[PDB]
Amino acid sequence: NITDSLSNRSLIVTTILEEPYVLFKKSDKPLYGNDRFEGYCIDLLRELS
Ligand SMILES: *[C@@H]1O[C@H](CO)[C@@H](O[C@@H]2O[C@H](CO)[C@@H](O)[C@H](O)[C@H]2NC(C)=O)[C@H](O)[C@H]1NC(C)=O
């Protein structure tokens, strides 16, 4: 069972604005935090979470 062993941990993740991997979300509303970014490795981070 390789489930949520790191469940209570909180991590800080740094990225650089590379267009095919991260992107600002195409919304007029000012988003906050992890809603501000989308892309390939953002989906990788979502799947790893
Ligand atoms: C941290 O994570 C653990 C497991 O990932 C959570 O565990 C349970 O906590 C309750 C309350 O003390 C226990 O009765 C259970 O036995 C625990 N589970 C296991 C498998 O031991 C814990 O709640 C988390 N801490 C938080 C959310 O503050």
The largest sheet is: 2 strands, antiparallel
The number of distinct β-strands equals 2
**Span between N and C termini?**
16 Å
Strand content: 5-15%
Give the helix/strand class.
alpha+beta
Structure description:
With 49 residues, the protein is α+β, with helices and mostly antiparallel strands. It is 18% helix and 8% strand. The protein has one helix and two strands. It has a two-stranded antiparallel ribbon. The longest helix has 9 residues. The relative contact order is 0.18. The structure holds a molecule of 2 linked components (NAG-NAG). The site of a molecule of 2 linked components (NAG-NAG) has 2 residues, from loops. The PDB classes it as membrane protein. The entry lists the keywords glutamate kainate receptor 2, membrane protein. The entry is titled "Domoate-bound GluK2 kainate receptors in non-active conformation".
Q: What characteristics describe this protein?
A:
1 chains; 49 residues; alpha+beta; 1 helix; binds a molecule of 2 linked components (NAG-NAG); Glutamate receptor ionotropic, kainate 2; membrane protein; ion channel; homotetramer
